[PDB]
Design a binder for this molecule. Structure first.
Ligand SMILES: CCCCCCCCCCCC(=O)OC[C@H](CO)OC(=O)CCCCCCCC
Ligand SMILES: CCCC[N+](CCCC)(CCCC)CCCC
Ligand SMILES: CCCCCCCCCO
Ligand SMILES: CCCCCCC
Ligand SMILES: [Co+2]
Lengths: 219, 212, 103, 106
């Protein structure tokens, strides 16, 4: 079971603060440290700080300006990082990780996407992508769904609740006038659709929305 | 702080080949180096600890070696799921530090794209917008050009494109091209076409539909 | 039973506890000091053993105030405890020599 | 003696920007580096001790980092009163030595 649970997203206004959580589960010892790691889009892993929850002592990266304050709650088993007075420089994925006091991060959170923007939250519109009537078919057919007008990142797109995996690519989103848009592409044997059903599921954590969209032939 | 240099930044290899990632520490750190794999949009995953120790669940394919200042992550016989970023990390001295990353790239056989064009949806038309979406899928090499034609005439405005990183399932690339119009602008034209020019053929691959 | 052997036993248990708590507290004290090597638990336990026996190879050592206070407690406890074993052996030998003499 | 190299000799920056001064020691000196600010016609003034420790009265703007051979003095958001010469100093080994100086320019 997921050892470390982080929210998918936080939207924060320039100059405002946010408090990220990281709920630990599994084997827990006094020797355990929880680390926080910052990753900007396309760049690498940068170490922010650590906390020993069994004692509450926290240490910080001295090379970088101090935006973080680390705390932990022994009873709820939750580590927190308070990020204060953010700018667009602070927009990133922030991972938590657990170290058993022996130097390596045995396990990582899935990460929280933090977007620092004035602009407002907006759930996506999900549209079907089925072939038009002249589209000649092969042994395979390509369907998709279009996920547009959302903010901020990210969205997660699955097919048939994750049970459809092979033949999927979801494209990186594009930003235009403070809104994101992407598409996902599934390819199944053509004989199997539309008899066997095909649905995309689009989760957008910043608006706590998850919508479904079934892909049916045009008419 | 201990500096961890990983050079080259990118590594190209042919399937089934043996690959070696390099990590050099600015001072001597015994064997206190750990290696992580991070796939596109995934979190890092521990592969090797203390320079050479196996983790359970990691394929036997992966090994590590080295001590002092020079460290190597090796993969016997690379395969598609190994397409990722690779980071080293030191725990010899406070603070822990990461290397900058080596990206692994696979050189597979050339492949032509599978093009698909999609008319806007009725749900979208209802909202007063129209998006024509074109997929250029599973091609190799990554270099590709998409062109739009409305009623025979090359269209350039309102076209946004997106490319995927190399695919960890088959080592190919994919691209989407999206022409966005108002319902109105979409109503006063008939045929919408998507053209893909790729290494694998001097002739473009073309897909189109008519609004009726 | 006899005080010297009770104290030896007790010395040994105390020393084990000092080693373990010293390892844990040395890591606590030393993380957050740039350059510190005494920062993971397994080598900290080794470091505290080689400090208690006063062997001190120099492969590891604290660089902070509290790490060094921790180190001092560990030294004093290793020296003291091993001293107590020597004392208890001398009591044992002295008592047996009184006997062998008929005293 | 321990050689302390400070390069660049001059640093140009725009107001409110983050600036980083570099100090490199010819051998390893843990964290035994201290930083001084000297304004035009003034005496040196201690800013940071043992590589990262605050002095009281110094603006929170100033921080230090590094150990071994590589040291950094940083200023979050430069302002006019920061125009000065900046020197590092080592106390790891006898004799104490100074770096050659970085001038800050806005
Ligand atoms: C002849 C006069 C002797 C005076 C010495 C007094 C030093 C003690 C406290 C001063 C606080 C300080 O700023 O030192 C801690 C220092 C923090 O920078 O780090 C240090 O590492 C100091 C190491 C001292 C370890 C001594 C342990 C002995 C039980
Ligand atoms: C062979 C070991 C003897 C080392 N001693 C005692 C051991 C301590 C565990 C050091 C004590 C000094 C405080 C004796 C000094 C030797 C001159
Ligand atoms: C003197 C020995 C007691 C330990 C001192 C404090 C422990 C580490 C604090 O962070
Ligand atoms: C504060 C308690 C002291 C711990 C023993 C040091 C080894
Ligand atoms: Co008598």
């Amino acid at each position: 079971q997921v050892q470390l649970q982080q929210p998918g997203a936080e939207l924060v206004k320039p100059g405002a603060s946010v408090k990220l959580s990281c709920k630990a589960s599994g084997y827990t010892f006094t020797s355990d440290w929880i680390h926080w790691v910052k990753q900007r889009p396309g760049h690498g892993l940068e170490w922010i700080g650590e906390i020993i929850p069994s004692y509450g002592r926290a240490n910080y990266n001295e090379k970088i300006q101090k935006k973080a304050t680390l705390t932990a709650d022994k009873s709820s088993s939750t580590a927190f990082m308070q990020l204060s007075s953010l700018t667009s420089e602070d927009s990133a994925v922030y991972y938590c990780a657990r170290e058993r006091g022996d130097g390596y991060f045995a396990v990582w959170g899935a990460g929280t996407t933090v977007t620092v923007s004035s602009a407002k939250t907006t759930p996506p519109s999900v549209y079907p992508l089925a072939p038009g009537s002249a589209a000649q078919t092969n042994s395979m057919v390509t369907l998709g769904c279009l996920v547009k007008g959302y903010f901020p990142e990210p969205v997660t797109v699955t097919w048939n609740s994750g049970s459809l995996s092979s033949g999927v690519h979801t494209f990186p989103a594009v930003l235009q006038s403070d809104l994101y848009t992407l598409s996902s592409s599934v390819t199944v044997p053509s004989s199997s659709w539309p008899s066997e059903t095909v649905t995309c599921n689009v989760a957008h954590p910043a608006s706590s929305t998850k919508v479904d969209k079934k892909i049916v032939p045009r008419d | 702080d201990i500096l961890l240099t990983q050079s080259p930044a990118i590594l190209s290899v042919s399937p089934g080949e043996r690959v070696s990632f390099s990590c050099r520490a600015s001072q001597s750190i015994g064997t206190d180096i750990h290696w992580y794999q991070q796939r596109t949009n995934g979190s890092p995953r521990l592969l090797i600890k203390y320079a050479s120790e196996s983790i359970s669940g990691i394929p036997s394919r992966f090994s590590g070696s080295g001590s002092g200042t020079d460290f190597t992550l090796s993969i016997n016989s690379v395969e598609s799921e190994d397409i990722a970023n690779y980071y080293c990390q030191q725990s010899n001295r406070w603070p822990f530090t990461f290397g900058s990353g080596t990206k692994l790239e696979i050189k597979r056989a050339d492949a032509a794209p599978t093009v698909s064009i999609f008319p806007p949806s009725s749900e979208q038309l209802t909202s007063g917008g129209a998006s024509v979406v074109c997929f250029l899928n599973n091609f190799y090499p990554k270099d590709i050009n998409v062109k739009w034609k409305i009623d025979g005439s090359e269209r350039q405005n309102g076209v946004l494109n997106s490319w995927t990183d190399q695919d960890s399932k088959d080592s190919t690339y994919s691209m989407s091209s999206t022409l966005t119009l108002t319902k109105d602008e979409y109503e006063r034209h008939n045929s919408y076409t998507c053209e893909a020019t790729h290494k694998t053929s001097t002739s473009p691959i073309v897909k189109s539909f008519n609004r009726n | 039973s006899a005080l010297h052997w009770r104290a030896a036993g007790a010395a040994t248990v105390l020393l084990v506890i000092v080693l373990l708590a010293g390892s844990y507290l040395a890591v606590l004290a030393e993380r957050g000091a740039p350059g510190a090597q005494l920062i993971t638990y397994p080598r900290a336990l080794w470091w505290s053993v080689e400090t208690a026996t006063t062997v001190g190879y120099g492969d590891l050592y604290p660089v902070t105030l509290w790490g060094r206070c921790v180190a001092v407690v560990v030294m004093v406890a290793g020296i003291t405890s091993f001293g107590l074993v020597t004392a208890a052996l001398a009591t044992w030998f002295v008592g047996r020599e009184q006997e062998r003499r008929g005293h």
